[PDB]
Amino acid sequence: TFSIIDVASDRRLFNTFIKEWKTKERYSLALACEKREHDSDGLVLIGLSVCWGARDSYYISLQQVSERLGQVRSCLSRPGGVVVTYDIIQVYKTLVLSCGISLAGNCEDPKVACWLLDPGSEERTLPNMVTVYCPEELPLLDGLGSAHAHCPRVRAATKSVLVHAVMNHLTGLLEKDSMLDLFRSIEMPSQVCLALLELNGVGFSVEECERQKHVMQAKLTALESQAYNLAGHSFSLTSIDDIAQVLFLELHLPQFSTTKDILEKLRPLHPLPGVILEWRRITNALTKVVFPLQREKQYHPTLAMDRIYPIAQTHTATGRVSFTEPNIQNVPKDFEICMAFSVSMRHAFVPFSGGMILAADYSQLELRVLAHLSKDQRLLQVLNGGADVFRCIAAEWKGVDPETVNDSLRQQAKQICYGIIYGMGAKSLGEQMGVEENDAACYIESFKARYKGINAFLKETVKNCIKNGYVQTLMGRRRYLPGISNTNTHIKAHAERQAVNTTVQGSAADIVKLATVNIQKRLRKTYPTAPLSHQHTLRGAFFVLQLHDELIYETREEDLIQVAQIVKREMESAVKLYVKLKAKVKVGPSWGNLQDLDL
DNA sequence: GCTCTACGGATGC
DNA sequence: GCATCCGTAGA
Ligand SMILES: Nc1nc2c(ncn2[C@H]2C[C@H](O)[C@@H](COP(=O)(O)OP(=O)(O)OP(=O)(O)O)O2)c(=O)[nH]1
Ligand SMILES: [Mg+2]
């Protein structure tokens, strides 16, 4: 039955546990943390629990410790040897930040497996797992502590045995879905990479952020002065009611939806919608970036700099990775204040002293992925010759030379292309393009006619989703879309759009995770003596940010060239598609100041 | 009748 | 009285 052996109680017992632990091809590890403080070994993290089959759990107490932790480090760092933990990122970060132990080897996390089996479902707690997947272990839930009495050793042992059972069931479930090698070769190493990113943080100059904040606040005072002058009274710029009054009630064209439609037929008609738009953009910047970042900032003393530590979400409908605490991914790009000041929220994100930011983006990634999946011969030959499809779309749309395509113009062409691929209608295309309804419909017809393989892939993806109830990515991840067969046409169409989008975007996410893993492997081979993160303590790169197809690394100046070569090679060789996977590598003294490193 | 993500402020029942 | 909702930013 449910047993708790205390191996950290005798020399021979602990040594036998270690020598049996090394041989085991798969165990479950759990952390026992009595959190009187909210990162310390023997003060917060109290112990370690290890479970193999037959409802037995071995608890290693980290109280009194040097030799216990040394042998646990030896086994936990390359003892097979698969460690199963609930919330792998949390466990890895806690181990690093408390006792300086890095989980080296193959990891498994029942959370990641449950998300694999049904990514559109809810994040199941471990109890939630036991009730659903392992009902025969339900009597053990009384013993995962409680909100009042935890007993961290007993809670750890119960969680470890439950995680072992749950992952044993989920392993067979994943093999049935043919997602097991993908789980073990792609998904879990990506989890470790993300935890290592979370440990790294991203450098953050408070001085630069304070400078930007002061300029933005002076600009907001000026903007409020103009807005109260362009209207007449001192209304509220943060109230949609106080905006829909003054707007649409004196001379405008319409509650009333005072949204960024004030760009349309209002920005070129009255200057207050532009002033309101600028005020809203700077207010977004302040209240969603600089105020959160100035309160989320944390001083790294070893690096002698401030850093921001985001939390990776990773439980996503499509396999993407987002972040929680500051929401770093959505930090705005540069924009101009006239007083011309350049608000660069990314310019506040800086490397350590003597360091460089290295950012490697995937060139038109989902175009290439879709060209491979659809086998569209036209797109294959076009983008295998180094062409920029976004540039050519922008040129043929505007009639301008492709070489004279602006970066913002390229963004609109990119949005048009991806929207068309992902089920955008004629009305939305007309809005985003300026053309009429019929013109946008004919544009979509021409897009599907010249890229015949793309239309065939769209139809086949929807047909196979109806026939199977799910869609599959390039590397085998499935998403279930029960609305694909809904009688209501809106839910059915929504599921078809999600089917195509999930296929292509999940495949791109899979490629990006693979590239992250392979870059990490090559970096470890090239600089074996470097620290894994900024919390492990500088040679090589450090992976401070992930941008769904872009990997930010923060390398040393001397290692910049080698790191860029490594990153480019790994990103281009992640997957052998019918397309080439070109990566654009940029270097700079800051995230907001990056120059192309032609290499 | 583009998808995905989070998140501040405001509706909104 | 809080709970989502939505518009917003990235991608
Ligand atoms: N559905 C949709 N997906 C988008 C949109 N913008 C970006 N994404 C997805 C598709 C892109 O392939 C992917 C990576 O983002 P990027 O903006 O960097 O674009 P892409 O890689 O296509 O272009 P690039 O050559 O890097 O400029 O993100 C969008 O407007 N709609
Ligand atoms: Mg890209």
Numbering used by the authors: 1979 to 2016, 2048 to 2073, 2094 to 2108, 2114 to 2288, 2317 to 2401, 2442 to 2639, 2653 to 2714
Task: Provide excerpts from the study.
To assemble the ternary complex, LcPol θ-pol was incubated with the incoming nucleotide dGTP, Mg2+, and a DNA duplex (20/29 mer) with a dideoxy-A (ddA)-terminating end, to prevent chain elongation. Final 3D reconstruction and refinement yielded two structures at 2.4 Å (complex Ia) and 2.8 Å (complex Ib). 11 and 18 bp of the duplex DNA are visible in complexes Ia and Ib, respectively. In complex Ia, the DNA substrate around the minor groove contacts the thumb domain. The 2.4 Å structure of the LcPol θ-pol complex Ia allows confident modeling of the active site. The B-site Mg2+ is coordinated by three oxygen atoms on the incoming dGTP, D2463, D2664, and the backbone of Y2464. The nascent base pair is surrounded by a series of hydrophilic residues, with Q2534, Q2517, and K2516 on one side, and R2382, Q2607 and N2603 on the other side.
DNA polymerase θ (Pol θ) plays an essential role in the microhomology-mediated end joining (MMEJ) pathway for repairing DNA double-strand breaks. Distinct from its homologs in DNA replication, Pol θ-pol exhibits low fidelity and possesses TLS activities. In this work, we characterized a Pol θ-pol homolog from vertebrate Lates calcarifer (Lc), which shares high sequence and functional similarities with HsPol θ-pol.
